[model samples]
Target: SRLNRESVIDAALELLNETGIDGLTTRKLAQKLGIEQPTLYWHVKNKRALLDALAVEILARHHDYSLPAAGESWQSFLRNNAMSFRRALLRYRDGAKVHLGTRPDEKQYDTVETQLRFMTENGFSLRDGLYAISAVSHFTLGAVLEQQEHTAALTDRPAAPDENLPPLLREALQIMDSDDGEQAFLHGLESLIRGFEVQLTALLQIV
Candidate 1:
């Protein structure tokens, strides 16, 4: 008899929690579930398929995509949404790593569409909205990666400005390093969103 699909998925997720993205395999999943590798294959076609399913599963955990309606400026909406998504990604042991590079699946589209609508409603042209969304996503990805690296000790300390670097770089580093990691993330996100908003406003004026 075949194992249940949910059971297989659950087993795979367990393996992911234990082993991370790279270390997960069909064989390991089957062994973890006390089944043979062939049984695992009956449910999932291949490694990529399993990963896609896992990504979807992870996104499913944080299905609450509502943004505030009162005093809900676009900037606040964007910031809050980004922060929420980042926190969700941080929930799993290697959540960000699992999510960073994969193509956006349908399960992830609600959040993306919410972001797009927010951008479009905020005086951004369609092109500007697209760019803004991309900017937010890139900023989140970069921040998540930085956080992950720091957690993993990929860098002993945050990147610092060398004496030979420009004065502005030195000043920015001084301010950037002054905070807990959360503040630093918000700083980068806020600055990027503000700069993009300025550009969007300029474009709207010209149009």
Candidate 2:
């Protein structure tokens, strides 16, 4: 007596954590919801469609920085947006994988348009604005994917004999492996923002 779009997707998200992306199936979802397959199908068409919905839902629920605040700079907005996205993708099991390759929901058109317009008003051409957004989005997605795939257990494994490894290689791995994930992400994000500023400077002939 209580299966609507939100409930169905909420159940699917729960099932997702239990089984992950590959293990999550409509059959499992139906069982979890205490409903038959036909009833579940009334809400989502199939696995892919459900995954798409979950991807959008994840952002809609967790992402809080889509639009810039009063007098926010493009770089500041982009950095905040990326951080928000990275956090959301890391929220669920295989969350990044679920988001990979899914198109934005039509309901998000206005939000996206507003973001793009914000970029244009800040002196970026339409194509450049789109490119900037795509670059940051893709960068965040890749970072989260790598972070999730490289689980904590894997990093806990013993390293090869320190004597056998060259000093340079050992030092590099020691620093890289021990460095905080958030630090690395922030360093890379700052680099990207600075690069964009350089590009904008040339476009505006700001010598």
Candidate 3:
């Protein structure tokens, strides 16, 4: 009846699939494993640690990522990495919620370094590289969160009419109503990359 880390993550993942993060309680996880609550501590100290594990589980499942090749452009490399991360998050139900909720471990710092390295090598200054990746990272997370929220609301009861909205708000909502999540994500990422493209060229001019 001993449990390994893999087994714990497997059970937790199953529970996450069955229910969203709210339902993935330590008690429920222990129940799924046929172990007592206290015994669950043997594997994970507490729900905080368990959620931490669950948060990183998607990353753990991600296929190994390496730095961009010499011939690979920075835009392609970062876009590819963003797409890969999004794909991994979408694989599990509420994956974005879990990913964003947990505090990241030191292990994720490697990803930060790789992203910065890509930008810096592509004619961006070190500070600009950090700023650029930070922007992209935040944009990706918010986009996916909205994407999931849009899906989650599909079956909910319709909202009452709100007539106080401005013309700009009406148009923005209309645009979102017509947009597909996948396409929207891709377009947003492309725009972000293009923004960086402008930044890259401008940075090179000063030196």
State which candidate has the highest TM-score. Answer: 2
Error of 1 at 83 (Å): 0.7
For each candidate in the order shown, give its overall lDDT on alpha carbons.
0.71, 0.85, 0.77
- Residue 120 CA error for candidate 2 (Å)? 0.9
Give candidate 1 regions above 4 Å deviation: 1-5, 66-71, 108-111, 153-180, 204-207
State candidate 3's TM-score. Answer: 0.81
lDDT of 1 by residue, 1-207 (tens): 336766666777778777777668777877887877776677777887877777677767753443546658777777777887777666665666667667777866875677667767778867777877678777876777666656656334555448687889788865755753678788889898888767866764763
lDDT of 3 by residue, 54-98 (tens): 777787786244357568998888788788777777777777787
Model 2: per-residue Cα lDDT over 88-165, one tens digit each:
988887888899987668989999999989999988899988888888988888888777767733756855588898
What residue pairs clash in candidate 3, if any at all? Answer: none
* Most accurate candidate by lDDT: 2
Using all chains and alpha carbons, the TM-scores for the candidates as numbered come to 0.75, 0.87, 0.81
Candidate 3, residue 135: lDDT:
77
For candidate 1, which ten residues in a row score worst on lDDT? 152-161
| Superior candidate under lDDT, 1 versus 3 | 3
RMSD of 1: 4.8
